[PDB]
């Protein structure tokens, strides 16, 4: 057994961590006080859930997590919330003033003050690990802390933990729920400094999650609570293989091996189905074919794009519920004849399938109905470059006038880092187009 | 009001669509780089489809189908017909074609050798010797069987090609404009030499004897139908238009899964120009598909009005039909 | 469709379906860039306090 | 995240006293500092503007400054006068005589160090100080001349804190003296360099709103300050109340100010109300949105159709459909997209607070960073040059040590501000 440490940075990272860890406890049967009656090995053990939870002598199951925000009010809700007993106070780290939606303030000015504190709190969890395999980092592209302090954290983790894998869960900026105009600046800056330090990153466009909540949950004005509970489900599907018995994606290395043949192109597209409203009185349960077919509908993706006009390098299907391989192959056979699924020539055309028999767990009183079977598809398609194109276009519009640049330069950053970062994104956009012509 | 932008100043069809939209008083035009548009009349090359459908509170529509170039490039059209089972290698209405890179070269020479034992081919320019055409290519191309026995109008002994304008809306309805045009050759068809190609190439730009028989070397369906009755004892609907409607529907139904915007965050429509070639036996052959076609002056007013009614006002409604819907 | 590497357990199964075969910076450099930016903040603050002294 | 409030001069203390009356009523604080409200939302962010004293009392973090005792004695006698900490009253005796030089160089110099001692005392008690907000007029002497001296000295001692002002612009429609364009031009030169955010409250706009819209034939300063206190309440809603957006002064500056010198905002309010008269028809969300963008609701006499919006902030107060707010806000942008710069994507952000202001069921406050505000500085620059080309009334200033060169420099810097706003009006 090898342990994984989760790190939640900024508001978006912390609040999504709240969602995921609440969901994890429900799936593994862990009470809010940390007790887990089904665990018969008191005080320790190397079961699959011990990848994410450590154990105390009294039987408490503590997440291998650390929350860090440059401003206290969000983590303070964790310190007083339903799962306050779950976490040790030392792994909840708060500053006093935030980064003010300013990458350079979170990376240079304030980040320098607190980077050594976090790294030693991270060290306290690593010493509890017999064989640490790496980190799962949750953060937003647009926030000053989520972008600025994460890229500084990712730089130092490569120094202190060189042999370790690092996976990102990144929240892509969407104007319908963001209250900052400089998110494209922060997004490009943080992607340039982090790119070589992340082995695999799952982007989540808030615009896609927002629309899924409106369309399939009939929520008129989705809140972060609506979005984060849905995002936690997808995250849970992705991490389930690390927390449960199986043979697919059993370690963080296997994520890069199965999904990322090119180091720089490490942004798999995630599609999830079915999303069913809990208020729906009558619902016909969808089949294996119907939910596998929904994985190739753009309206169900975490990022809106068209995989028909790109090429695949890898494809995983992660099923939860009443699913058997016979029905999956029958569904893949039908879908291949009716859809534009094209792989790059140097890659085998096919799917790696993982099935977990336990149906998806929904939090009581949430918006998602319980289903009999669900699937998450992780596909490394070049079509996700559309999200970089959108972001870089917005970047180019503002930067051409040098609008808001003075806020970053005034924090010690040099104007050249903007163009240097944009140049890297220009290279990234070019690599996708080479692979997917 | 509705909003639209114009990113192709060279488009004669959508220039008229811009005017008709402004004359409604319910459409306002913005600057090219303004993202808060309802409709985009986009550029022909490198249209940014990836930036469409991401403006909150705006239903967005564009006058091009992403991926339709697979049908509107000579090299892509051949590959699409030979690989798609819906059309197959034994497609009866497309001429034998082979892609050559300056390639199926060896597969092509096998057909030309069985043709050695009518062996005139076109490369796209006409030739009868296979080696000569290949020498021309190097100095991407597709070689195609040159149809040696075409239907010739009289008086004149003249070659022609038929252009049909087809509109495909956001719902993927296929609308064939009832008015087509015959682009005629004003010089009699000479089968003895292909180097002189003013009687073979029916393009308007080749027609610099221009304008003798009909104005602008353009014959519309009214006259061409009347000719077919008096000369061949048939009608344009029966002898030619059924095959044209079959070809248009077959091509577009093939690529529908790859270009449809039914469940997308933006919508697409597109006007196409299908070019047909009729042989001695009243059989229609598909020559090519044009992704950004131009109309004929007599038909600009009626066709561009129909583009608004069927493709634009169907999505953005305001405050007898000239199209034939091809059913699928 | 070839189904390979089928593994089963109480929790579930996994397998692979194939349809067609194929056809950095050191801690020293981090500390220096963070101090170069702090130097630039202190220079811009000194220029401000010098301007206010005038 | 505490804010330190300063009010300087006659106008500064009158609108400042009204501001504290309005927000104390919103937060449920009585004139004695005792909280007698009903909702705990009233106190979740009460520390931003109030210090907690002995006996569960709330004392405003306010410092009252004047060179005359007259207006401040009126404040201490007013309805909420006893709520202010008596030590925070700092005043001289000579007055400033509507003279920018007296407030900035002579009379105000004597008094400014004692103001800074009170400022320092309030700042040392702060958990984490965001910055300062100042209320003042630019046409007088104390608020204009001393107010900008204070701002310069506060920036010297707290260079990394946010400086925010509510600055009242003079207008011959509501004029005390002819030297007001002189004082305003000298002060704007300071505001351009030493503040992060300035709400331009034009007395011309307040007079026209009172006259044309509210049907008040002879407006008083009390009628003008009713509009100021309503605007000041609205623009500080997100700083005082919890919501989706827990805003602070720095995030406001970062997102509203794309270029450092262009930080002069047009405030707007809807629905426009005159005091002592209540209208009983609540507005629909389409009506709030249409009126808050109407030029007749702007507090700076500028035609927004003559410029382009760099950034826009909108705050809706009341119980309403947040979906209808999004549709209506998106409807304004999509229908007048030429007036919003294309090179700042998504430059209109919206906030919602459930507590409406006193006497309204629904309200909407507008904060626009428009390039049309150059019209305001053009107006003051024309009135300035009309007198300065003949050196008229300059003896009042040169008698306090000033040189004509300082006037020339101030005129130029404001004319540069005007041309800089015109730079981005064409781009
Ligand atoms: N999905 C999701 N997105 C969020 C959440 N909170 C904030 N965001 C998004 O994150 C972006 C803003 O970043 P934040 O995380 O709020 O900022 P931060 O990382 O805390 O950094 P600073 O506040 O600037 O110090 C916006 O695009 C928001 O839409 C959340 O809880 N869930
Ligand atoms: N297989 C064939 N047999 C006989 N004639 C052919 C032919 N292929 C092409 N032609 C002739 O060549 C002429 C022009 O060829 P083609 O249409 O492919 O070029 P083009 O694309 O530049 C004109 P457009 O785009 O307007 O259709 C046609 O009008 C037709 O008369
Ligand atoms: N809106 C408003 N403006 C005022 C008020 N009192 C004075 N003014 C304006 O402020 C200017 C006079 O400055 P004032 O504050 O009285 O002088 P000071 O005490 O030296 O700062 C003139 O332009 C007045 O119109 C007020 O209560 N409300
Ligand atoms: C132009 O874009 C923006 C404009 C304003 C803001 C932000 C972005 N983002 C922020 O965090 C602070 N903020 C606000 N500040 C204040 C004091 N009051 C507000 O009322 N409504 C908003 C929104 C808002
Ligand atoms: Ca155990
Ligand atoms: Mg934050
Ligand atoms: Mg062509
Ligand atoms: Mg006065």
User: In the numeric block, which tokens belong to residue A252?
Assistant: 């963080």
| A410–C41 C-beta distance less than 8 A | yes
Residue D401, number of CB atoms within 10 A of its CB: 10
Q: Are D144 and D150 in contact (CB under 8 A)?
A: no
Chain B touched by A72 (CB under 8 Å)? no
Interatomic CA distance for residues B10 and A252, integer angstroms: 53
Eight-class DSSP state of A262: S
Given D375, D400, D416, the domain boundary residue is D375
Look-up: residue for tokens 């995030």? Answer: D251
Q: Rounded to an integer, what distance in angstroms lies between the CA atom of residue D67 and that of residue D141? A: 9
H/E stretch holding A424: helix A416-436
Same domain, D112 and D253: yes
Nearest CA-CA partner of A200 in A149, A116, A133:
A133
Q: Which residue has the tokens 């091809």?
A: B326
Task: Judge contact between B174 and B310, C-beta under 8 A.
Answer: no
The beta-strand segments (E) located in D176-276 are 197-202, 264-270
Tell me, what CATH number does D286's domain have?
3.30.1330.20
Determine the Cα–Cα distance for residues B222 and B224; give it in Å rounded to an integer: 6
For residue B285, the ligand 2 atom closest to its alpha carbon is: 1
Q: Which of B264, D364, D324, D334 is nearest to A221 (CA)?
A: D324
- Contact list, A356 vs chain C (CB under 8 Å): 11-12
CB of B95 within 6 A of ligand 2: the answer is: yes
Interchain pair D248, A401: CB under 8 A: no
Q: Is the dihedral of CA D359, D361, D367, D368 positive or negative?
A: negative
- Of A360, A372, A383, which Cα lies nearest the Cα of A283? A372
List the 223-282 stretch of D: residues with Cβ below 8 A of A. 244-246, 248, 250-251, 254-255, 257-260
Report the candidate in D85, D110, D169, D79 with the shortest Cα–Cα distance to residue D378.
D169
**Residue B223: C-alpha distances to residues A396, B213, B216, B217 (Å):** 56, 12, 14, 13
Residue A69 CA to residue A142 CA, distance in Å, equals: 14
User: Shortest CA distance to D189 belongs to which of D423, D398, D377, D426?
Assistant: D377
Cα of A10 from ligand 6 centre, angstroms:
5
Q: What angle do CA D242, D245, D247 make, to 5 degrees?
A: 85
Dihedral angle sign, alpha carbons of residues A130, A132, A133, A137: positive
- Return d(Cα A156, Cα C30) in angstroms, integer: 8
Contact: B3, D334; criterion CB under 8 Å: yes
Query: How many residues in chain D?
Result: 427
What gap in Å lies between CA B216 and CA B224, rounded to an integer? 15
3-state secondary structure of A294: helix
Closest CA to B284 of B239, B233, B325: B239
* Interhelix angle C27-53/A144-160, nearest 10 degrees: 140
The DSSP line for D174-202 is B-S-TTHHHHHHHHHHHHHHH-SEEEEEE
Gyration radius (Cα) of chain C, Å: 30
- Token pair for residue D9? 């001069």
Experimental method used, please? X-ray
Q: What is the DSSP track for B189-226? A: --SS-SSS-TTT---TTT---TTSSSGGGEEEHHHHHH
Report the distance separating Cα A429 and Cα A423, nearest Å.
10
The answer to whether A300 and A376 are in contact (CB under 8 A) is: no
Burial of A330 (0-12, 13-18, 19+ CB in 10 A): middle
Which residue out of A144, A171, A408 has the highest number of ligand 1 atoms within 8 Å of its CB and is therefore the one to mutate? A171
Nearest atom of ligand 3 to the alpha carbon of D169? 23
Q: According to the annotation, is A99 in a ligand binding site?
A: yes
Contact D402, D183 (CB under 8 A): no
Q: Domain boundary residue among D267, D284, D302?
A: D267
Q: What b/e string do you get for C43-52 counting C-beta neighbours within 10 Å, with b at 16 or more?
A: eeeeeeeeee
* Three-point CA angle B68, B178, B73, nearest 5°: 20
Whether D334 and D372 have beta carbons less than 8 Å apart is answered as: no
- What are the φ/ψ torsions at residue B280 (nearest 5 degrees)? -65, -25
CA distances for B142 relative to B99, B103, B124, B133, B318, angstroms: 5, 9, 5, 11, 46
Q: Is A413 in Cβ contact with C26 (below 8 Å)?
A: no
For residues D295 and A320, give the distance between their C-alpha atoms in angstroms, rounded to a whole number. 57
What gap in Å lies between CA B13 and CA B20, rounded to an integer? Answer: 11
Residue of C nearest to A354 (CA): C14
Please say whether the beta carbons of D169 and D381 come within 8 A: no
Among candidates A315, A317, A319, which has minimal Cα distance to A286?
Answer: A319
- What is the distance between the alpha carbons of residues A378 and A384, in angstroms, rounded to a whole number? 12
What the block records as the tokens of D354 is 């459930």
Planar angle of CA B60, B64, B67, nearest 5 degrees: 115
> What is the C-alpha R_g of chain B?
21
**Cross-chain CB nearest to D251 (options A100, A175, A404):** A100
Which of D323, D345, D349 is nearest residue A397 as measured by Cβ atoms? D345
The pocket of ion ligand 8, defined by CB under 5 A, consists of D 10
Chain C residue numbers touching A108 (CB-CB < 8 A): 34, 37-38, 41
Probe target for ligand 1 pocket from A105, A106, A113, A146, with the most ligand atoms within 8 Å of CB: A146
Q: Could you tell me the two tokens for A142?
A: 């647009």
The first and second tokens of residue B23, run together, are 């004359």
Residue nearest to atom 4 of ligand 4 (CA): D313
Rounded distance from Cα A98 to ligand 2 centre (Å): 67
CATH numbers and ranges of domains, chain A: 3-259 (3.40.50.1440), 269-385 (3.30.1330.20)
Report the 10 Å Cβ neighbour count for C32.
Answer: 12
Contact assessment for residue A9 and residue A118, using Cβ atoms and an 8 Å cutoff: no
> At D6, is the secondary structure helix, strand, or coil?
strand
Q: How far is C50 from chain A (nearest CA, A)?
A: 17
Report the alpha-carbon distance of residue B159 to residue D423 in Å, rounded: 62
Q: Which ligand 4 atom minimizes the distance to the CA of D238?
A: 18
Is the CB of residue A324 less than 8 Å from the CB of residue C6? no
Contact D151, D190 (CB under 8 A): yes
What is the crossing angle of helices B105-116 and B130-138, to 10°?
150
Q: E strands along A216-346, which residues?
A: 269-273, 312-321
Question: Do D178 and D312 sit in the same domain of this protein?
Answer: no
Buried b (16+ CB within 10 A) or exposed e, C9-21: eeebbbbbbeeee
Token reading at B150 = 């075409």
D274 and D360, same domain (yes or no): yes
Q: Give the residue from D220, D248, D267 where a domain finishes.
A: D267
Q: How far apart are the first and last CA of chain C?
A: 81
Are residues D287 and D382 located together in one domain of the fold?
no
Number of domains in chain D: 3
CA distance B278 to D283: 69
DSSP string, A171-224: EE--TTT---S-HHHHHHHHHHHHGGG-SEEEEEEHHHHHHHHHHHH--SS--H
Reading the block at residue C12, the tokens are 């579930």
D154, D159, D260: best to mutate for the C interface, most C CBs within 10 A: D159
Same domain flag for D88 and D100? yes
Sign of CA dihedral A204, A210, A213, A216: negative
C-alpha distances (whole Å) from D80 to each of D16, D20, D23, D65 are: 11, 8, 11, 17
Closest to A106 in 3D by CA, of A140, A63, A55: A140
Q: Nearest CB to D259: which of A182, A394, A403?
A: A403
Q: Name residues whose C-beta falls within 8 Å of residue D321's C-beta, 6 or more positions apart in sequence.
A: A220, D285
DSSP D284: P
Neighbours of A176 (CB within 10 A): 16
For residues D204 and D175, give the distance between their C-alpha atoms in angstroms, rounded to a whole number.
Answer: 10
Q: How far apart are CA D297 and CA A229, in angstroms?
A: 41
Angle A223-A225-A230 from CA coordinates, rounded to 5°:
105
CB A155 within 8 A of CB C28: no
Question: Residue C24 has which token pair?
Answer: 């950095």
Q: Are A359 and A374 in contact (CB under 8 A)?
A: yes
- Residue D387's domain comprises 376-426
> Could you give the C-alpha distances from D290 to A351, D287, D320, D328, in angstroms and in order?
54, 5, 16, 9
Name the residue at shortest CA distance from atom 26 of ligand 2: B203
Q: Both tokens of residue A43?
A: 């005080």
Is the domain of D114 the same as that of D259? yes
How big is chain D by its Cα radius of gyration, in Å?
21
Place of tokens 């497609």: B91
The domain spanning residue D63 has which CATH number? Answer: 3.40.50.1440
Q: In Å, what is the CA distance from B58 to each residue of A42, B37, B168? A: 57, 7, 22
- Is residue D176 a known part of a binding site? yes
The span from the CA of D292 to the CA of D230, in Å, is 13
Token duo for residue A359? 């149906």
Tokens of B43: 């550029």
The span from the CA of B256 to the CA of B144, in Å, is: 26
Say yes or no: D285 and D188 in one domain. no
DSSP string, B83-122: H-TTT-TT-TTS--EEEE----HHHHHHHHHHHH----EE
Q: Helix or strand or coil: residue D24? A: helix
Dist CA D265 CA D315 (whole Å): 14
Tell me yes or no: is domain B2-62 CATH 3.40.50.1980.
no
- Closest residue by CA, ligand 3 atom 17: D140
Chain C residues near residue D155 by CB distance under 8 angstroms: 52
Strands B61-62 and B267-268 come out as parallel
Strand-pair category, D197-202 with D264-270: parallel
Residues of chain A contacting C, Cβ within 8 Å = 104, 108-109, 112, 155-156, 158-159, 196-197, 244-248, 319, 324-325, 328-329, 332-333, 336, 343, 345-358, 410-414
Nearest Cα to A291, choosing from A380, A358, A376?
A376
Question: SS3 sequence, B113-163?
Answer: HHHHCCCCEEECCEECCHHHHHHHHHCCEEEEECCCCECCECCCCECEEEE
- The residues that bridge with B61 in the sheet, in sequence order, are B39, B267
Distance between CA atoms of residues A23 and A16, nearest Å: 11
Which tokens sit at B299? 């038909």
D35 in a known ligand binding site: no
One-character DSSP codes across A32-44: TTS--TT--STT-
d(CA D192, CA D373): 13
Touching status, chains B and C (3+ beta-carbon pairs under 8 Å): no
Look-up: residue for tokens 């009443």? A322
Say if residue A274 is preceded by a cis peptide, omega within 30 of 0.
Answer: yes
- For residues B108 and B133, give the distance between their C-alpha atoms in angstroms, rounded to a whole number: 12
- Kindly tell me the burial class for residue B225, based on how many C-beta atoms sit within 10 Å of its own C-beta (0-12, 13-18, 19 or more): middle
Chain C residues in contact with chain A using a Cβ-Cβ cutoff of 8 Å: 1, 3, 5-7, 9-27, 30, 34, 36-41, 44
Domain match, D416 and D287 both: no
Residues present in chain A in total: 437
Residues C34, A373: Cα–Cα separation, whole Å: 50
3-state secondary structure of A322: coil
* A389 → closest Cβ in B50, B66, B67: B50
Is A334 labelled as part of a ligand binding site?
A: no
Closest CA to D352 of D270, D241, D256, D268: D241
- The separation between CA B73 and the C-alpha centre of its own chain, rounded to angstroms, equals 11
Question: In this structure, what token pair is assigned to residue B104?
Answer: 């199926």
The answer to whether B31 touches B6, Cβ cutoff 8 Å, is: no
How many angstroms separate the CA atoms of A402 and B119, rounded?
A: 65
Closest residue by Cα to residue A408 from A192, A191, A193, A182: A182
Q: What is the dihedral of CA B72, B73, B77, B78, to 10 degrees?
A: 160
């Amino acid at each position: 057994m090898r342990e994984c440490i989760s790190i939640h940075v900024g508001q978006a990272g912390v609040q999504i961590g709240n969602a995921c860890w609440e969901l994890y406890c429900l799936e593994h049967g862990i009470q809010p006080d940390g007790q887990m009656p089904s665990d018969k090995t008191i005080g320790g053990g190397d079961d699959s859930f011990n990848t994410f939870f450590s154990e105390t002598g009294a039987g408490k199951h503590v997440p291998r997590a650390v929350f860090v925000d440059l401003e206290p009010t969000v983590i303070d809700e964790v310190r007083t919330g339903t799962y306050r007993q779950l976490f040790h106070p030392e792994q909840l780290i708060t500053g006093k003033e935030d980064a003010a939606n300013n990458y350079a303030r979170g990376h240079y000015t304030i980040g320098k003050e607190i980077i050594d504190l976090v790294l030693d709190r991270i060290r306290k969890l690593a010493d509890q690990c017999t064989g640490l395999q790496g980190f799962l980092v949750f953060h937003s592209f647009g926030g000053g802390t989520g972008s600025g302090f994460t890229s500084l954290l990712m730089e130092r983790l490569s120094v202190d933990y060189g042999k370790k894998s690092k996976l990102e869960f990144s929240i892509y900026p969407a104007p319908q729920v963001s209250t900052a105009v400089v998110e494209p600046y922060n997004s490009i800056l943080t992607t340039h400094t982090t790119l070589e330090h992340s082995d695999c990153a799952f982007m989540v466009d808030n615009e896609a999650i927002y629309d899924i909540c409106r369309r399939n949950l009939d929520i008129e004005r989705p809140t972060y609570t609506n979005l984060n509970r849905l995002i936690s489900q997808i995250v849970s599907s992705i991490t389930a293989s690390l927390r449960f018995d199986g043979a697919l994606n059993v370690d963080l290395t296997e994520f890069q091996t199965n999904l990322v043949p090119y180091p720089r192109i490490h942004f798999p597209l995630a599609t999830y189905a079915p999303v069913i409203s809990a208020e729906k009185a009558y619902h016909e349960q969808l089949s294996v074919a119907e939910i596998t077919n929904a994985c190739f509908e753009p309206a169900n993706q975490m990022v809106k794009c068209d995989p028909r006009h790109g090429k695949y390098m890898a494809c995983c299907l992660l099923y939860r519920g009443d699913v058997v391989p016979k029905d999956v192959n029958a569904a893949i056979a039908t879908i291949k004849t009716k859809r534009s699924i094209q792989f790059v020539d140097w890659c085998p055309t096919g799917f790696k399938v993982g099935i977990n028999y336990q149906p998806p767990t929904v939090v009581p009183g949430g918006d998602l109905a319980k289903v009999q079977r669900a699937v998450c598809m992780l596909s490394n398609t070049t079509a996700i470059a559309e999200a970089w194109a959108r972001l870089d276009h917005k970047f180019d519009l503002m930067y051409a006038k040098r609008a808001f640049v003075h806020w970053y330069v005034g924090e010690g950053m040099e104007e050249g880092e903007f163009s240097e970062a944009r140049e890297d994104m220009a290279a990234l956009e070019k690599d996708y187009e080479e692979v997917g012509v | 009001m509705y909003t639209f932008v114009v990113r192709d100043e060279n488009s004669s069809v959508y220039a008229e669509v811009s005017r008709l939209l402004l004359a409604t008083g319910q459409w306002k035009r913005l600057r090219k780089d303004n993202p808060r548009f309802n409709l985009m009349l986009g550029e022909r090359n490198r249209l940014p489809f990836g930036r469409l459908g991401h403006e909150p509170g705006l239903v967005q529509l564009v006058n091009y189908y992403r991926g339709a170039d697979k049908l509107c490039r000579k090299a892509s059209l051949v590959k699409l017909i030979k690989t798609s089972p819906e059309l197959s290698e034994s497609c009866t209405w497309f001429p034998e074609s082979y892609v050559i890179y300056p390639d199926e070269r060896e597969v092509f020479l096998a057909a030309y050798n069985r043709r050695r034992e009518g062996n005139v081919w076109i490369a796209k320019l006409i030739s009868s010797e296979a080696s000569e055409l290949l020498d021309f290519i190097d100095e991407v191309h597709v070689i195609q069987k040159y149809l040696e026995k075409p239907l010739l109008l009289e008086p004149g002994h003249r070659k022609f090609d038929i252009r049909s304008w087809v509109l495909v809306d956001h719902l993927y309805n296929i609308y064939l404009y009832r008015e087509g045009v015959l682009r005629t050759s004003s010089e009699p068809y000479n089968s003895a030499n292909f180097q002189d190609k003013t009687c073979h190439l029916t393009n308007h730009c080749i027609q610099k004897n221009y304008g003798r028989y009909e104005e602008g070397n353009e014959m519309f369906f009214e006259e061409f139908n009347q000719y077919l009755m008096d000369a061949l004892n048939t009608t344009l609907e029966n002898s030619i238009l059924l095959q044209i409607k079959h070809i248009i529907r077959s091509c577009l139904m093939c690529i529908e899964p790859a270009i449809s915007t039914k469940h997308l965050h933006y919508q697409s429509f597109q006007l196409f120009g299908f070019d047909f070639m009729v042989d001695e036996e009243l059989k229609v052959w598909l020559i090519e598909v044009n992704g950004a076609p131009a109309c004929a002056q007599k038909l600009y007013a009626e066709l561009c009005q129909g583009i608004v009614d069927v493709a634009i006002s169907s999505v953005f409604p305001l405050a007898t039909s000239i199209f034939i819907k091809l059913h699928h | 469709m070839e189904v390979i590497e089928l593994n089963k357990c109480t929790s579930g199964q996994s397998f692979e379906v194939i349809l067609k075969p194929p056809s950095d910076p050191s801690l020293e450099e981090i500390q220096k860039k963070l101090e170069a930016a702090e130097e630039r903040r202190k220079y811009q603050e000194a220029e401000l306090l010098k301007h206010l002294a005038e | 995240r505490e804010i330190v409030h300063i009010q300087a001069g006659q106008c500064g203390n009158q609108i400042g006293a009204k501001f504290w009356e309005v927000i104390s009523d919103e937060h449920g604080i009585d004139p004695t500092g005792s909280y007698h409200g009903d909702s705990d939302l009233q106190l979740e962010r009460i520390n931003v503007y109030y210090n907690e004293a002995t006996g569960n009392k709330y004392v405003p973090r306010a410092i009252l400054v004047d060179l005359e005792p007259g207006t401040m004695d009126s404040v201490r006698s007013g309805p909420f006068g006893q709520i202010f900490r008596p030590d925070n009253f700092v005043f001289g005796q000579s007055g400033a005589g509507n003279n920018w030089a007296k407030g900035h160089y002579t009379e105000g110099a004597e008094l400014v160090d004692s103001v800074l001692d009170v400022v320092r005392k309030e700042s040392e008690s702060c958990d984490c100080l965001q910055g300062f907000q100042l209320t003042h007029s630019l046409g007088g002497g104390t608020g204009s001349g001393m107010g900008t001296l204070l701002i310069s000295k506060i920036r010297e001692e707290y260079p990394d804190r946010i400086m925010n002002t509510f600055s009242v612009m003079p207008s011959p429609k509501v004029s005390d003296t002819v030297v007001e364009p002189y004082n305003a031009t000298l002060s704007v030169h300071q505001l351009v360099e030493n503040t992060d955010e300035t709400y331009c409250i034009d007395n011309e706009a307040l007079y026209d709103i009172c006259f044309r819209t509210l049907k008040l034939t002879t407006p008083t300063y009390g009628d003008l300050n009713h509009l100021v206190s309503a605007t000041m309440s609205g623009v500080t809603t997100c700083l005082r109340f919890p919501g989706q957006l827990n805003a602070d002064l720095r995030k406001l500056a970062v997102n509203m100010v794309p270029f450092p010198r262009l930080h002069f905002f047009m405030p707007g309010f809807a629905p426009l109300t005159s005091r002592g008269s209540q209208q009983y028809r609540a507005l629909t969300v389409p009506e709030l949105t249409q009126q808050m963008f109407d030029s007749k609701n702007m507090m700076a006499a500028c035609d927004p159709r003559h410029g382009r919006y760099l950034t826009v902030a909108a705050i809706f107060r009341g119980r309403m459909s947040m979906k209808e707010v999004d549709e209506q806000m998106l409807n304004v942008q999509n229908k007048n997209s030429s007036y919003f710069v294309e090179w700042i994507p998504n430059n209109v952000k919206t906030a919602v607070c459930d507590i409406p202001p006193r006497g309204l069921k629904m309200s909407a406050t507008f904060i626009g960073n428009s390039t049309a505000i150059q019209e305001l500085f053009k107006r003051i620059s024309e009135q300035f040059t009309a007198m300065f080309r003949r050196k008229a009334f300059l003896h009042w200033y040169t008698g306090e040590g000033m040189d004509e060169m300082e006037f020339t420099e101030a005129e130029s810097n404001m004319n540069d501000l005007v041309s800089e706003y015109q730079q981005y009006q064409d781009a």
